[PDB]
Each structure stands twice: as structure tokens, then as C-alpha cells.
Amino acid sequence: SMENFQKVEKIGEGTYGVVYKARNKLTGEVVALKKIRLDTETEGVPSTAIREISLLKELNHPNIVKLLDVIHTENKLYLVFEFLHQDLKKFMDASALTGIPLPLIKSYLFQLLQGLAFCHSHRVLHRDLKPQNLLINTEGAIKLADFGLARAFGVPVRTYTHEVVTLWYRAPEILLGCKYYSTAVDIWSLGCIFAEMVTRRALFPGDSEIDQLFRIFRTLGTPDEVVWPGVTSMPDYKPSFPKWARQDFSKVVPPLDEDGRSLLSQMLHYDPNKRISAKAALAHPFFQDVTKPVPHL
Amino acid sequence: VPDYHEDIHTYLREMEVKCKPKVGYMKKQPDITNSMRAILVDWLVEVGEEYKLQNETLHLAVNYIDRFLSSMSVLRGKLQLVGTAAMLLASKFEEIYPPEVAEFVYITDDTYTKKQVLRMEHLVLKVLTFDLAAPTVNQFLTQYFLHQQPANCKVESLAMFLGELSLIDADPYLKYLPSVIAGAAFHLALYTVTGQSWPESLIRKTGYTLESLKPCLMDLHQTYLKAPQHAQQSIREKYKNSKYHGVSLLNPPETLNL
Numbered sequence A: 001s002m003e004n005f006q007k008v009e010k011i012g013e014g015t016y017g018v019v020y021k022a023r024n025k026l027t028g029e030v031v032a033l034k035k036i037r038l039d040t041e042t043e044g045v046p047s048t049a050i051r052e053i054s055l056l057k058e059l060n061h062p063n064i065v066k067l068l069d070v071i072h073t074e075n076k077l078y079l080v081f082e083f084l085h086q087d088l089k090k091f092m093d094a095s096a097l098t099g100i101p102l103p104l105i106k107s108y109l110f111q112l113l114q115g116l117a118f119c120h121s122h123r124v125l126h127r128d129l130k131p132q133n134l135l136i137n138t139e140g141a142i143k144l145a146d147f148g149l150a151r152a153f154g155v156p157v158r159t160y161t162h163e164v165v166t167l168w169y170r171a172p173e174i175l176l177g178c179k180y181y182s183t184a185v186d187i188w189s190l191g192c193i194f195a196e197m198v199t200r201r202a203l204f205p206g207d208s209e210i211d212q213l214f215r216i217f218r219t220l221g222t223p224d225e226v227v228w229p230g231v232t233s234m235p236d237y238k239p240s241f242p243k244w245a246r247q248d249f250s251k252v253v254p255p256l257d258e259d260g261r262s263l264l265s266q267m268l269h270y271d272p273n274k275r276i277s278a279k280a281a282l283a284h285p286f287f288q289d290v291t292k293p294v295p296h297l
Numbered sequence B: 001v002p003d004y005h006e007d008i009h010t011y012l013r014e015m016e017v018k019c020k021p022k023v024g025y026m027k028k029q030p031d032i033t034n035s036m037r038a039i040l041v042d043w044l045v046e047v048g049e050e051y052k053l054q055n056e057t058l059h060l061a062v063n064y065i066d067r068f069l070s071s072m073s074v075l076r077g078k079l080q081l082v083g084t085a086a087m088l089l090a091s092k093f094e095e096i097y098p099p100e101v102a103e104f105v106y107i108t109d110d111t112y113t114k115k116q117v118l119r120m121e122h123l124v125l126k127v128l129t130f131d132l133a134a135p136t137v138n139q140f141l142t143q144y145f146l147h148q149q150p151a152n153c154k155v156e157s158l159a160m161f162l163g164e165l166s167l168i169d170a171d172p173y174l175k176y177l178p179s180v181i182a183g184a185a186f187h188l189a190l191y192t193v194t195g196q197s198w199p200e201s202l203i204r205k206t207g208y209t210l211e212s213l214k215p216c217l218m219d220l221h222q223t224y225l226k227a228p229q230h231a232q233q234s235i236r237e238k239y240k241n242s243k244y245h246g247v248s249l250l251n252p253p254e255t256l257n258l
Ligand SMILES: Clc1cccc(Nc2nc(OCC3CCCCC3)c3[nH]cnc3n2)c1
Pocket: A011, A012, A013, A014, A015, A019, A032, A065, A066, A081, A082, A083, A084, A085, A086, A087, A132, A133, A135, A145, A146
């Protein structure tokens, strides 16, 4: 079943399973294989694989990792995916003495926004956007990957899982216990990623939920009823929260130009209703000169 | 947050045609019948109530059973096993805390083993080729509810109730797409509770008018009128609860004047 694939090395482990680099012996295609250990008399096929496969077979897009096949054995399940060369986190690491050239940053964000609008227009929430789940190739593409925490949503949304998003990229409405979250949580993550590509350090690296909330509040101001109607009634909202004054965005990501700051501040708006959708962000003046430089590795 | 409401609606319209079960499959099933499928669905409604599952979970399980039975011949003693595996898969896909496999094994009262449930889960995945994100009547209802002037909780729960009743009876409801059943259930609920009719803003959205909803609506009306007599009664009982505003013992209108 796996007869025509030749394993090359282990790539890593994400939300569930294990990923390897492999080579199709007959066609030459290099692929990533995500091995899913099943068993039986356990839970059967994990809900994470069920959601990942059914959603990725629907999501055909240049900026979304392409699921090529599913090899479904009595014992194991193997997801065959197009092979990407590196993760954004490793690329930023490799660039941290020099920095990522502005045009590559803009192209990467433009591409991420396209992948994300396509997800959201197909009723899919990603819910784990972070630099290690964003994969680049040597032709300048960048693609959303690891849909292990994703889910299909309904209009209007109902309550979904609370334990979502790695903490440094987690939106405020999740941190505060909102009953309903939606597509704005993936935009907040991407806005933290955009800042991180530019400063090359995580915008809000908290070590706990309340630390994460205070880090966000010291940068954007502690939210009130004016900025975010309803904030004070949120479940984990506390009247004892320190009231920090909002920082001037030119000080938040100092190298960003006016267009860039305007775009980042709309991706980090507190109120998920005012936070910019991915579709609308693609027409932001920041991208008027977007091109596609590649990366290197 | 309506930036994608129309892209999503358009996409669900495209996918419900691709997820559509085969309209006359029961006449190709040697051993099972419409009435046997009614008994299975009624039972799944009871299971959803017992583990407090979402209504969407129920609608997805049923879509999985109808698509599985569309290409797989099943003996009557195994129909519950297919329905159990489908309900397990739908719980995994849609629920925050699905029941565990042992809970599914227990509620078949040990008719099957855990090993058979897990082997059937895999068979259903392979038959449906892992394509489980199917549009449901419930997903179209919820988008239609947004057009209400003002919102009416009785209208919503009664449209859910009517949409659910259509799951039980393959004949006639397997002919109608999820969006159309939802349009009939929304109009019927609205007319029963308020006197109002399918709004003009939903003709613009959907393209459906009362004339195009007419065949489904005539079918749904009769189902509504005859509900108290149907051999399956778990949906009327579930909709006696206050969680659903007691809508099942609202009186159906005698005529629709269409
Ligand atoms: Cl050396 C190298 C370095 C990074 C990536 C990759 N390649 C690659 N990895 C995947 O999952 C990688 C996975 C690793 C753990 C964290 C989540 C992502 C893929 N899924 C579809 N295509 C994929 N391509 C390779």
C-alpha cells in the first residue's frame, strides 16, 4: 500500500500523528507522509483525522497544503501531502541576523490572507495558525498546513471547543471566555504573525492565560465598553484588570510603514466584529505593490 | 459577521448536490425498507437526546446512512450497526465531546461488539471516501433564521422540528435537497406561528419562491398534520421540551392557502 514510497527522514510531529519526507519511487515526486496510528478497541479513527481529511479534500488552493491521497489500512492511515521545504519559524530563525526583506514579508502575508479567505469562504476555521504550521517552498510560495485543529463552522456559529489556538497567537475573545468565536480568531493569529515576521520575535509570548491577556493589554490598551461593547460582561473579564494606556502603533512594530501599521491595527482590533476579514485585507493599500520574491534555505 | 455569509451559502448549495443520496435506493435494497429506516432514524433521535448531542450531529449521521445505503446492500440485522457507526462518525466530526465508542456499544445493548463498530466505522469512511462535511437541513435553517423580522424563538424551534421529521421518512423526503426542505420548514413554521410567509429577502438569497417550494411544502404539511399518528414519535417527544419551546404541541394550520 505504501510500496511505491521510499521514506527519506522524519520531518516532525504536529497536532496528531507523525510526518516524514518520502519519495514516490515511480514518479519521482517528493511528498510528506503523515502516519496516523489507528488500532481498534480504542476510539477508532481520531476526530482530528476525520476533520483534517474531509476538510482538506474540499480545500484546493495554491496557499493551502494539498492533500494528495489517503492510504487507509486496517492498522494505519497515511495522509500523503505535497512536500514543502521548511516552516516559517525556521526561516525567521535563519534570517534573524539579517531580517526578512519587506517584499517577501508582504508577499507572504498576501498569500496567507488568500489561503485564509478561501478557508473562511468554505466555512472552515483553522484555529492553530502559528509560524511552525506555515510552510514555504523554494519558489516563494507559503501555505497553511496542519489542519489537525480545524473545523467546519455554521452560520451563525454555535459554541465550539474552548481549548483552541497556541497561546501566543490566541485571540482575546477566546482568552476572555466568549461563548462564540469565529473567523476573526484566525485573523488575530495572522496579525501576530505579521508583527513577528517584521520584528522576528513573538508579539505576545505569554506563559499563561492571564499573562497573555496582560501582554495584549499593555500593547493595545486594556479594552473598555467604548472600544469593545460587551467586554465587561465577558465570563473571564475581571473589573480588577489593570487599565493600561494604548500604545502608539508606530512603537509596536517600529520598522513598519503607515500602510503596514494600518493593516496590522485592523487585524488586531479587539472587537471581532470590527476586526478585518481576510477577503477585505487583500485590498488593503499595503499590498498595492505586492510581488512574489521566493524565500531561501 | 456577514463577509462570508453569501460565499458560504453558495458553497453549501454546490455541495448538497454532490452529497445527495440516491433518491430511489430503497427499491434496490433486498432486505430493508423505508419503515425499517424510519425505525433506525427514530432510534438515533433517542440516542442524540440521551447523550445531549447537537441536532446537526443527527442530520449528518442520517446523511451518512443514506449515502452508505445508496451503494451498499445491507441486511436488516446490520442496519443498526451502520447507523451506530454513522452516529459515532458524526459525533467525532461535529461534537466538542463525542460519546466514547463504549457508550455507542452499550446503547446497542450489546447487539454488536466494539470491534464490529470500529470495523464498520472504517467501512463507512471508505464508502463515503472520507467526505463527511455535508450540508444539512439544519445548516440552511440557521442561515434562513437570520432573515426573520424580529427573531422568534417559536419559529426557529418549530422549523427545526419540521426539518427533523423529514429525516424519518425517506419517502418522500429523499427527493428534496436540504436547502428546499429547510425553505419549506421555515415557511411552514413561520406561517403556523405568525401568519407571515417566506420573506422576499430569502427569495433574493436562495432563488426559491413559494411556487418552487410548493411540492415539498405540501408534503411537509401532511407530515405535520399527521405527526401525532406516525408510528415513530421520538421527535415529537423531544420537541415537547422547553429547550425547544414546547413547539411540538403547537397546532398545525389546517390549510396553507397557497
Ligand atoms: Cl525539512 C521540512 C521542514 C518543515 C516542513 C517540511 N515539509 C512539510 N511538512 C509538513 O508537515 C510538517 C509538520 C511538522 C510539525 C509542525 C506542523 C507541520 C507538510 N504537510 C503537508 N506538506 C508538508 N510539508 C519539511
